[PDB]
Amino acid sequence: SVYDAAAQLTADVKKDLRDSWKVIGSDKKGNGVALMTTLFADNQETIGYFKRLGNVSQGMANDKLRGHSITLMYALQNFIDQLDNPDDLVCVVEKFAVNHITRKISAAEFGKINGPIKKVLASKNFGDKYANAWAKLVAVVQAAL
């Protein structure tokens, strides 16, 4: 269950998430757009899913892309704030899962975000340990897909 995946995140994983989020979450516009543009660069097959945003190659200049990317960073803020209450984490993960289920995004496709997260973290010198912690949070969402 989602709860199981949630309930599993340990004190050390939560620490590494919070520590790296302090940095990555401090520039939501810049890091959110880098996350999205990295997804599109590395996984070109996903571009079609984002047709509402218009020409995503425009980066920061594309207002729809910038609004989406900032907002995505607040979904991660939300998850980070809920880490200590699995019950609250589960209900917000289930809400965002629905946003993706309705777009036909599978658990495997959702996991394509791990590559972009690892690259953004690495840009701030957070290494593999940090990328592994983030994959475990992503895995909570995958449990709902």
Q: In this chain, which of 15, 29, 103, 129 binds ligand HEM, going by CB under 6 A?
A: 103
Q: Is 112 in the site for ligand HEM (CB under 6 A)?
A: yes
**Minimum distance of ligand HEM from residue 138's CB (angstroms):** 6
Q: Looking at 14-22, 82-90, 109-117, 125-133, which segment touches ligand HEM (CB under 6 A)?
A: 109-117
Cβ closer to a copy of itself: 64 or 119?
A: 64
Q: Are 137 and 16 in contact (CB under 8 A)?
A: no
Q: Looking at 12-20, 26-34, 71-79, 123-131, which segment touches ligand HEM (CB under 6 A)?
A: 71-79
For the segment 49-88, give every residue that binds a copy of itself (CB under 8 A).
52, 63-64, 66-68, 70-71, 74-75, 77-78, 81-82, 87-88
Q: Is 44 in the site for ligand HEM (CB under 6 A)?
A: no
Question: CB neighbours (10 Å) of residue 36?
Answer: 23
Query: Reduced to 3 states, what is the DSSP secondary structure of residue 104?
Result: coil
Q: Are 145 and 107 in contact (CB under 8 A)?
A: yes
Q: What is the DSSP letter of 143?
A: T
| Beta-carbon-side half-sphere exposure of residue 53 (alpha carbons within 13 Å) | 24
Distance (Å) of CA 60 to CA 30, 95, 122? 8, 27, 21
Question: CB neighbours (10 Å) of residue 61?
Answer: 10
Q: Is 28 in the site for a copy of itself (CB under 8 A)?
A: yes
